[PDB]
Amino acid sequence: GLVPRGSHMMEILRGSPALSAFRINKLLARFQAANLQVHNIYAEYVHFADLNAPLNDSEQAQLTRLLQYGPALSSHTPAGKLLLVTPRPGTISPWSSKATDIAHNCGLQQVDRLERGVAYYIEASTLTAEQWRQVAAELHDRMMETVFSSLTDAEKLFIHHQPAPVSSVDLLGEGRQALIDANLRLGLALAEDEIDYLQEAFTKLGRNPNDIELYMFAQANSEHCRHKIFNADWIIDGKPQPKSLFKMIKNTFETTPDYVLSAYKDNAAVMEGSAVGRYFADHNTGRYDFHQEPAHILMKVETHNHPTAISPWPGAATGSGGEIRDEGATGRGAKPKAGLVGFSVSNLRIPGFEQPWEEDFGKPERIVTALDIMTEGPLGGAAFNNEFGRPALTGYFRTYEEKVNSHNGEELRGYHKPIMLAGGIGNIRADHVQKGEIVVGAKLIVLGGPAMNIGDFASVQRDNPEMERRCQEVIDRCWQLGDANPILFIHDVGAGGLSNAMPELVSDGGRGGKFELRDILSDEPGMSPLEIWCNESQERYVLAVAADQLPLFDELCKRERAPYAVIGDATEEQHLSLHDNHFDNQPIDLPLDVLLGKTPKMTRDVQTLKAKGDALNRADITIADAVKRVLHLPTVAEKTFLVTIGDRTVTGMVARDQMVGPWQVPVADCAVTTASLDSYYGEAMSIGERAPVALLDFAASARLAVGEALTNIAATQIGDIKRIKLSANWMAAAGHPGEDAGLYDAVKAVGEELCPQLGLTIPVGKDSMSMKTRWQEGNEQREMTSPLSLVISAFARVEDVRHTLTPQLSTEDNALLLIDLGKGHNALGATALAQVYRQLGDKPADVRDVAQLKGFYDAMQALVAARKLLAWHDRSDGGLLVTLAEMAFAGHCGVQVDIAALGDDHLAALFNEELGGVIQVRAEDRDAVEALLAQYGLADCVHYLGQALAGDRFVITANDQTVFSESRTTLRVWWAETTWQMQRLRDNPQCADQEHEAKANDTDPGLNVKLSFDINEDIAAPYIATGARPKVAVLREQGVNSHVEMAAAFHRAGFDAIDVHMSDLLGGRIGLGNFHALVACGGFSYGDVLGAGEGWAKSILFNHRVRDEFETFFHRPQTLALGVCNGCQMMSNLRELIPGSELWPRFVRNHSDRFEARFSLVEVTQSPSLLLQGMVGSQMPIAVSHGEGRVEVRDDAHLAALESKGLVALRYVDNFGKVTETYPANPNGSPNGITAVTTENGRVTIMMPHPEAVFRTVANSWHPENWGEDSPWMRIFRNARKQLG
Ligand SMILES: Nc1ncnc2c1ncn2[C@@H]1O[C@H](COP(=O)(O)OP(=O)(O)O)[C@@H](O)[C@H]1O
Ligand SMILES: [Cl-]
Ligand SMILES: [Cl-]
Ligand SMILES: [Cl-]
Ligand SMILES: [Mg+2]
Ligand SMILES: [Mg+2]
Ligand SMILES: [Mg+2]
Ligand SMILES: [Mg+2]
Ligand SMILES: [Mn+2]
Ligand SMILES: [Xe]
Ligand SMILES: [Xe]
Ligand SMILES: [Xe]
Ligand SMILES: [Xe]
Ligand SMILES: [Xe]
């Protein structure tokens, strides 16, 4: 396959079939649905290699072999009409960046670029050219892809354009008109006074502005970048106001500075953490060690609402990716640890599952549907978190779309433009919290990805998470140098690209800069200087480093394979210049104070609109019907489709994730991580939000968001409320009638009143101020406007991660007690209950009593510390009804509760969404607990409800009357139906159905353990005691992310864990000949492009020296190796080097066709595995996190031979203890539950689950109560140590 392509040659290589049978069946069913009459469809990947020089035979064999990957689906002879789908010309897929990288690291420098498309073969012998266009429309994404008729057309993707010159705007030759034309032509969106400012600036300089200078200015001065609304002066109902919104937020720091180390002067806030062992590999020795020191806590939350309305997968992916850059660029370098995720969208209207409150109102053609956002968006957000390697541990998901009588009268209110929210916490060293001095002469570097023309095609983002992982490793090497950290100053690259980030950086240091345009790394030679300087390409940071640290920085980057460029120098003069060596001229030449000068402050002069509620019309409402609808509201309903798609175990520090208890029910109210791998100190995150309340009462909605963040985090051991710090993220349709006054009133409500009075700081925050959508529907104008939507995220240092309560009810003798901080108001306005009957109602919840909310929190903290709680679940969407139901789902039990003391209105008592929740206590503690609550002023809020009982009965009485009684299993399965329907349409429907149907089986005993050995016996102790510590090579390739906890597991077992990067082996810095033990760690090397683990394995196989090195290590008589997850995939690709491995299977795309992050039950089976000695017959859960873990054999003969040889070491079992292939008990579809195999001599074991994630009991999502510090998985590492003797 090989043809001229300008001054290069393009080779075409056929790949493998691209779609599984159920995917083919969906295409055919959709074609029949549109009646396009299609007899058959078949699809095959095809690869395109643009070559700068020819391949000899052996290089050609290498290239072909690199492009063999993926499940072994049945080939077909091409037949019918070819439609080839590729990335749009002018764009380079992330697949292409990563695959070309593999090619280069396998020695194929002749490969200039690799790209991939899908060839579809459609047999539909009479369709009009018209119907052909609809077939083509159906097979590609119009925002990213194009459809071609010939394989040869792929040459269009590799055209090199000449560099486009700068363009000047003729102000001197045409006057102000030139600026007006450029404003419209370049879409600068400039205000009249901004046009005046530019006109005057350039008249003063006596020369025309260049397009690049105007664009840079336009970006810096957008609402998005300047925050004009948040800095504006206000007049409200005729009275000037004393403070901006930002100054009201700051008020919370003026009033509670406690524990804050950094607020409002960085792209994250920082608060005090805990002195613990920070674990990392020394720069000199490569050995991992604990460094006992403060691990302070940074936090940040951001949105990506507009781009997600256009292209939701990269919109959500880069929302997370951008936020992750903020966290690593805090101070002088910091480390992201865990993430959170939020979505608000309009009604799903799932086909065949439409709910009675949903009405189709239309939408703009150019945006995607709510369903499309909730399909592709969570996948994009998880793709980044999974491929970058941070666990995603808490989040919210709301649907809202209704015609409502609100502040501006009857209007459509919703989320056509969605909220896509991404946030997280990380750790930072004390001495790096402060940005450093920028020395005159400092080198100014771009760290990260080559620029492309990115940033409405302009709203289609692009993510490459692996590129960002490689940058994070360099930032980690830097801060891991302590006082020798060479980062003087670092900033993320986001809006405005370099044109914002570089000026901001020098400016923050009191300097200017001089830059060379042609030093910036670019994958698009056609780009204009404007495009190069201003594009929003992803995975970039800017930093300043002293000239003499450049050789160190260079070494650090090269070992990580993180690209970087020196692109300029910091100057004493406060000027900004950008030179271009190619055109020999100066695209930018400005004083900074001209560039960064501001037009006058905004004034908003506005008036209050307040909705008068309508009383809830109850004609159609019964309690039973209300329970059924409310559990079908996606806001309320089970969230599994948002949770198991995202890793929750990488770092080995996750103590509490969303899934709770033996039945792994996602109801955890907040996330908890341990502060290190050697401590019980930790960090917690929770979310509060209640946007629909803002349709009745702006300030109540903001108070409730703060209050729910607190009730969600309250059963975690924190102590002083001033330890809890908030992000406030404000989404509004600024300018829409009544929203501006409501915004000022809501910010005041929290910043000036509620938070100072509770002792809560808001040291970080952001705002997104055009939350609305307009389009033409008949030839009527239509508009969908969001409620004011405050999202509060709460972050806190944790005193003891072991003491966290979850909603999992005990059935030992117990009391359930409601804490009703609604004080009997029982408001029903703006509840899930109102919304599911198409109403807004009358009067919403609110914070009823500030002393009692603080009293609530302090009481909860006293009960958590004294271990007086069995369970906790707060009340929010769905009310007390949903809180009790979710506790019964998590406990897999019944409730017998009486509500007579809660008012005569049972509907109001069950469904109000007032603050509070239900604690469960031992029956014998009930009196002391009620006395404790009374001491905090709560007696009149506290109500004994009844008890949790074994069994399936969910019973609510009022005196002698049954208010509501149903099977708990029935409610649990209704509550599951949304995630079932989402999984069924997104993933393999067979796996969605199995998962859902297992829920209806009440006899399910949940995760449960059988141990064949003593989990507390440290069999490595006599070896550790001698002080003899053998090395283990902790092997990582670029994109590996689980190596730190892997090293820590081996360390606890007595090893000296050495960081061995593949670059170390390629560069000769490490030899395997010096090791007896090797482990290949997990993650996403090369983003799994070319098959998970393949580029890592082939880069070994195709370098003869490193390959000989691996083969020698494996052939030694006493070496031990382990491969986990990515390392298990890598090693299965290395069988030719491993003796005794001939029967090993391949590991390919899970049968569900979805990444699976699960806490799965396995049994240890009889094999030669030396790492599993003493464990055979044990059954216990383990962390699973993979999308390519399905064992695939050549045929049954290979499966039988593998089995009969006795080499299977681990199998998935269902909770009844049987070997299974039913999902998700077996999360990936592996035959015979196979998930680990060993070699004939037992010296090498590979497995897909992560024992290193869960070797600490505290890091097991569920575990038996009596376990000590060590989980059963700790024994694998101790077995390695004892085996080496
Ligand atoms: N978008 C999301 N991504 C990840 N996890 C989520 C998301 N939405 C909700 N969750 C998790 O699902 C569980 C139930 O969520 P939800 O009912 O919104 O919480 P609550 O009602 O306690 O505020 C929680 O553990 C939450 O963290
Ligand atoms: Cl169709
Ligand atoms: Cl702009
Ligand atoms: Cl939009
Ligand atoms: Mg103090
Ligand atoms: Mg909920
Ligand atoms: Mg909650
Ligand atoms: Mg919530
Ligand atoms: Mn009151
Ligand atoms: Xe190719
Ligand atoms: Xe400017
Ligand atoms: Xe956390
Ligand atoms: Xe108590
Ligand atoms: Xe090992």
Author numbering: -7 to 447, 466 to 1295
List sentences quoted exactly from the publication behind this structure.
Data sets of the xenon bound structure of StPurL were collected and refined using both native and a mutant version of StPurL R1263A. This mutant was analyzed and was found to be structurally identical to the xenon data set of the native protein (2.65 Å) and diffracted to a higher resolution of 2.18 Å and therefore, used for further analysis. Five xenon atoms were located using mFo-DFc map and confirmed using an anomalous difference fourier map. However, only three out of them were buried in the core. The other two xenon sites occupied shallow hydrophobic patches on the surface of the protein formed by crystal packing contacts, therefore were deemed functionally unimportant. The first xenon site (Xe1) was found nested in the hydrophobic barrel characteristic of type I glutaminases in the ammonia production domain that constitutes 24% of the total protein. The second xenon atom (Xe2) was located in the FGAM synthetase domain, trapped at the edge of the hydrophobic barrel formed between the two gene duplicated halves of this domain. The third xenon atom (Xe3) was located at the interface of the three helix N-terminal linker domain and the central FGAM synthetase domain. However, X-ray crystallographic studies revealed that none of the three internal xenon atoms were trapped in either of the proposed ammonia channels within the protein instead they were bound to select hydrophobic spaces within. Therefore, it is likely that the compact fold of the protein results in very few surface exposed hydrophobic patches leading to only three internal xenon atoms being structurally trapped.
